[PDB]
Ligand binder design. Structure first.
Ligand SMILES: Nc1nc2c(ncn2[C@@H]2O[C@H](COP(=O)(O)O)[C@@H](O)[C@H]2O)c(=O)[nH]1
Ligand SMILES: Nc1nc2c(ncn2[C@@H]2O[C@H](COP(=O)(O)O)[C@@H](O)[C@H]2O)c(=O)[nH]1
Ligand SMILES: Nc1nc2c(ncn2[C@@H]2O[C@H](COP(=O)(O)O)[C@@H](O)[C@H]2O)c(=O)[nH]1
Ligand SMILES: Nc1nc2c(ncn2[C@@H]2O[C@H](COP(=O)(O)O)[C@@H](O)[C@H]2O)c(=O)[nH]1
Ligand SMILES: Nc1nc2c(ncn2[C@@H]2O[C@H](COP(=O)(O)O)[C@@H](O)[C@H]2O)c(=O)[nH]1
Ligand SMILES: Nc1nc2c(ncn2[C@@H]2O[C@H](COP(=O)(O)O)[C@@H](O)[C@H]2O)c(=O)[nH]1
Ligand SMILES: Nc1nc2c(ncn2[C@@H]2O[C@H](COP(=O)(O)O)[C@@H](O)[C@H]2O)c(=O)[nH]1
Lengths: 469, 469, 469, 83
């Protein structure tokens, strides 16, 4: 990267300590920018969902993969559940979203609770595979909680066949009381649901698909036990990319696991981490890792800096690791510390190929965590860190080992009323990155890295501009 | 120490301005790290309790010495009380803790007040030296405050003979309603109490013992009056280490006291302070001090920076003093400014041999201060600084001298519900230090000092990570 | 001054950005330090009261001059009032304080209001010049507000003749219910009052006196109108030192006023300001000013930095001005920005001869402002800045000139319950300065300036230590 | 029976005060101070009064100190049968 003359601070830099200087540009609009990555992950947008049980899930994986991103399944998850999740993700449609399905014998409370599992805002009642009505929050209000779905006054729905152009579906929903359109197969069974916003997004985001035209998905493995057997089993399960995640990636165990995984010649890309030094990236790449995971400390649930003082500011670590990888022909991923699209844009300008977002996506409908309401009826969801699952591994021995184990951190993630779904956050981040590219004057991410000019600002410089949310 | 290239700030550094960069490591787990010090203090862990009347006490000394630390008794304490404290500490068992003892004729209010003197959560009723029952907070609830202990419905207790392996004691407490196990001598009298957590800790922490196999203890002396006579008297009392503490250690008086103490050839290690300069450490070591106490200003109750502007950031002072001492073959101690295990880890990486913790331990059950409850029933204890006791020394003359004397600072230290006892804080700090060593890649503290790489971060860098407590 | 190696910041420094590094010392106690100034002002302590109508007054001048300081009367004050103030100050006793006097015909409300005019806490009822009783806050409580003083149950008082050694007076007040001792002349009339604290202070502070043995006092003049005539008139009135104060001291008008005043050969020391540059000090000294006033912006009521952005951090300006003055054989005064004794100690170490304290002393009993009570009955007093009086000078013309005039700033200054009087603040500041001198190892202020070593700290370094009040 | 004996063993004029021992705890003394309306307790050693304990004395003292540590205040003494 290029810095302004005289901008050589005597300390490492974070996302808040840097800014992007505009340059001469010829990009007319945001839509002229290509956001496809070149790291081999197959993602058309530089967004990756972290491998956390509070974030990664079936609905989240499907929604992110449909819009071009990828989701890494949490490590140590049972192999059967991984198989079902992969099959469900790869069995989805590339355009039509999967709605919440209900039976006429279901309870009203179950319908109300399931209404928030998706951002569509409505659920499709299915009888013998055929839609028969719609359930919305207005219908369940005032009704006995233990009545049946068939008692609920099911509302009419706009129906269109599958394969219809999204423009027509958008047109039919212009005056529809409910902004959902059910897509029915030529047989007549339920194929999915579509919305005006979804129809608009269909023409903007290109889904990330494998060689067979199915949505991509990734799985994570630990370094304890037989790493090679687990990696081979997950590769056979249909995973498109493998991640070997650990708290400290610059250790012997990590390198041995990398070598064991690479010896199998599975053919899938390998992601390893985490390191915050050039030597660590050189060691991981030489061991056989194609992509290096970068970041130790900036995790929103990571307490390493408070427990140990060990860590590094994200920006300097990312730039150093990216330079080291590019030197050896590799790629790096920015992990942790993302709160705003500014962080993603700066990480991309730093030299990273992808930006792994973690606890930010936990405050969405698609997150596996159950929706909760605060004292002021404000919706929120609880998120937590992976704790010991990222660490290196008789009741007495169990208690002795768990005495020194780090506690599970927790925090509340509020849901934005206008950005309840993860697709809204994806739109936010993509708009920010596209605006950054237009300001720099780059048509693609490699040009963004090549042409960017960075600067250093003080504490007062960050507060400049509109008050942060 | 080694810093990153270009990290040469134009100001002194604190604990919040530095971070540890991970390196290549081969340490599998935390338990492979040896935390024994090499400064001659005999502590198996780098934790020292400050010589304050609000922190140092019999129970605190016993608990800290059992887990490997040492406690320095406050200066100017009466010699008889010092003798009783030393005898009580050296008469304890290396494995079995000392519980709260009660008589059947004792009041219920006295039992309730004494229940919080230890972290066991229960007290053993003793009649003719034989346990007869147990008193818990549930038993005293609802009972008249002025009834007798014999009126309280004493609960059954799990009994095991002394010398039993801690694994068996842990096994017998698996389903016990009260998580305490009383140890009885072959005669049948009370020898102590043991808990599941204590049984687990017994196999992790090696107690710090003298040549006779008894728990170690230290005492502090001032520089006023006859320093040599007091030092000799305390050495004869059984103290294992002598500390000469004063507010400003780089003065003539201090050096003369050091020379007088060293002329006696007591054979005990000598600790002197406090200085924050290399010249001060050179002067103290040449005077005969084996260990130099470092720190002027970062004390939680020290107002020198506000009254006088005199002081120095702890990290730079510690690194300079450690370099100067090692040059002359000495050792330094970090005193004050510790709030989190990050501070201890950074001080150890700076080059210090031990880290003296002060007011942090005051918010524990073992502290001599009486337990108090806030308006919201939150437990807390008051702590205060040593004031004039650290300064260089007719009602009229007394008032004239006390007119310019510094006031006694005070603050409230809340008790963590999950870390009420000092053993929990010791576990916290030891886990942090072990994780730091594993991240650096060091099997012992000298290797931690040799292999550590430091960095400099701005204000925004410190806020990175999980919100501080 | 001397800074630590590598401590060369790229910005100007304030009081909060610097610290004093301890050195080798041989000063046994605080009382061995001599605080006498060498700038010719005659003050035995480095404390000067600012020329503000909210701070400078008869009682404040007397109290400060008795303890060794000096008070500068506000400019543009009527000459008759200046004459009465000077006569009253020079007619006071060097040991015995002046108490509040009341008549038996006075109202109870007047007595209550006057009780807070002094820190003695009691008033002496005088009939025909002879004390007859004492009035305290307890006596007036519960009594009708419009009763007479003679109705109040006057309490007995300890009486001692003038010239008695303060030790005896302190002894007689050991068991006195009221801690005031009235001093009676050999005739038998009231000469003053004395307290235990006052008796103690009498042996510590040496009063600042002129050649005739009377308390010193100073007066301030502006630069508008005939400066020479006003200066000569104030010199004839008995002022011991002249100050020419203006907002911007580096201007032609200022220099012409200095020349006009110096041409009169009054023989009194001249103080001029304010400038924050070496060139300004050189210009003022060459014009005839013996002492240069330093500081533009750090005033607690100064809005120049917010209205104009013009100013300079106090520490760098003070060190530069002190170096420039000493080069030409002059002296400088630190003005504004004092909140704690740390500021005074740092200003003295910077090279200043005296430290002028302003709005800090406004929150005292001796300040001319009327005592006020907050909503929570907390005592406080209002303070305000000099505004246009420091600026360079038909209803229409008056309004046109006042349209651009700066507004009068105001703020609330709370009274410390333990430091209600200004003597307590003087004790605080003197103790801080003496402790600073002992830490540095200096027996006097010139040695403090010569031997001091300074350092630079970041924002986190300032927060180190006990929480600031 | 004990209550009746205690009631019938009292004096018709002089009230029964709260009695304390020098080895008693400060918390016990504070709690017992409110058992009577006298507002003070009489410290008794070998049947002889030696001092007085009031709420002001116990304030600021460690709760688990002894009664003998408390600064016992002087008391006005008069023989029984005095008018
Ligand atoms: N009936 C019904 N249950 C659902 C639906 N989505 C999720 N669930 C229930 O909720 C559980 C958890 O949902 P998940 O976290 O897998 O999306 C599922 O295993 C299933 O029992 C839906 O659309 N309809
Ligand atoms: N040390 C640690 N790191 C965690 C934990 N949970 C998540 N992380 C890290 O933090 C990243 C997410 O950070 P976020 O984007 O939420 O700020 C994850 O991808 C992972 O690298 C945890 O419990 N401990
Ligand atoms: N009966 C009884 N008193 C105790 C016990 N521990 C402390 N005390 C009382 O509390 C006082 C202060 O306790 P310390 O601060 O020495 O632990 C002791 O001198 C003693 O009077 C205990 O286990 N039993
Ligand atoms: N100047 C001063 N230092 C104190 C006082 N009390 C404790 N200290 C210092 O502060 C250290 C403890 O700091 P802490 O660990 O509580 O932040 C002590 O070991 C001692 O060096 C006091 O009253 N005055
Ligand atoms: N009777 C009486 N009035 C006083 C005393 N001190 C001040 N005053 C009144 O209060 C006014 C203002 O007080 P000053 O601000 O000059 O101290 C005086 O002019 C006088 O009227 C005092 O001791 N006795
Ligand atoms: N510009 C300006 N300076 C003032 C005013 N009042 C006081 N000052 C300056 O501020 C100094 C006092 O500052 P302080 O010690 O209250 O922080 C005075 O001695 C004078 O130099 C005002 O109204 N305007
Ligand atoms: N030491 C002492 N204990 C008392 C005194 N009065 C009451 N107690 C205690 O408090 C209990 C209850 O008091 P009661 O309700 O009988 O007045 C008694 O049985 C006794 O243990 C007293 O004056 N001194």
């Amino acid at each position: 990267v290029r810095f302004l003359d005289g901008h050589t601070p005597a300390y490492d830099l974070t996302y808040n300590d840097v800014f992007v200087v505009p340059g001469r540009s010829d990009v007319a609009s945001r839509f002229d920018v290509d956001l496809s990555t070149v790291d081999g992950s197959g993602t058309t947008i530089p967004v990756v969902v972290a491998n956390m049980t509070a974030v990664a899930g079936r609905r989240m994986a499907e929604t992110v993969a449909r819009r071009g991103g990828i989701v890494v399944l949490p490590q140590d998850l049972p192999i059967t559940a991984v198989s079902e999740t992969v099959d469900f993700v790869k069995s989805r449609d590339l355009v039509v979203d999967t709605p919440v399905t209900l039976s006429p014998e279901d309870s009203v409370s179950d319908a109300n609770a399931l209404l928030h599992k998706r951002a569509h805002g409505a659920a499709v009642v299915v009888f013998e595979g055929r839609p028969i009505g719609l359930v919305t929050e207005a219908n369940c209000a005032g009704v006995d909680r233990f009545a049946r779905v068939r008692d609920i006054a099911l509302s009419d729905f706009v129906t269109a066949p599958v394969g219809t152009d999204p423009r027509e579906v958008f047109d039919l929903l212009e005056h529809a009381p409910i902004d959902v359109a059910v897509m029915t197969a030529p047989d007549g069974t339920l194929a999915g649901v579509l919305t005006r916003t979804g129809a608009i997004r269909a023409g903007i985001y290109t889904p990330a698909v494998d060689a067979k035209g199915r949505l991509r998905i990734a799985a994570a493995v630990g370094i304890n036990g037989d790493v090679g057997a687990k990696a081979q089993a997950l590769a056979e399960a249909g995973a498109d990319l493998l991640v070997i995640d650990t708290a400290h990636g610059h250790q012997a165990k990590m390198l041995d696991a990398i070598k064991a995984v690479a010896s199998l010649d599975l053919g899938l890309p390998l992601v390893a981490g985490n390191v915050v030094s050039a030597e660590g990236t050189r060691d991981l790449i030489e061991a056989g890792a194609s992509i290096v995971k970068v970041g130790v400390g900036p995790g929103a649930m990571c307490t390493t800096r408070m427990m140990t003082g060990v860590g590094r500011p994200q920006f300097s670590a990312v730039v150093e690791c990216a330079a080291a990888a590019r030197q050896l022909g590799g790629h790096v991923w920015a992990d942790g510390g993302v709160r705003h699209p500014r962080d993603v844009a700066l990480a991309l300008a730093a030299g990273a190929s992808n930006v792994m977002i973690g606890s930010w996506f936990a405050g969405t409908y698609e997150s596996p965590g159950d929706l909760l309401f605060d004292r002021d009826d404000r919706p929120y969801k609880e998120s937590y860190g992976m704790a010991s699952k990222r660490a290196v591994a008789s009741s007495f021995d169990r208690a002795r080992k768990g005495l020194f184990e780090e506690g599970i951190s927790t925090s509340r993630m509020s849901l934005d009323p206008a950005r309840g779904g993860v697709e809204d956050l994806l739109d936010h981040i993509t708009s920010g990155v596209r605006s950054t590219c237009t300001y720099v004057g780059a048509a693609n991410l490699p040009e963004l890295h090549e042409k960017v000019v960075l600067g250093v600002q003080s504490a007062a410089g960050f507060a400049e501009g509109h008050p942060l949310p």
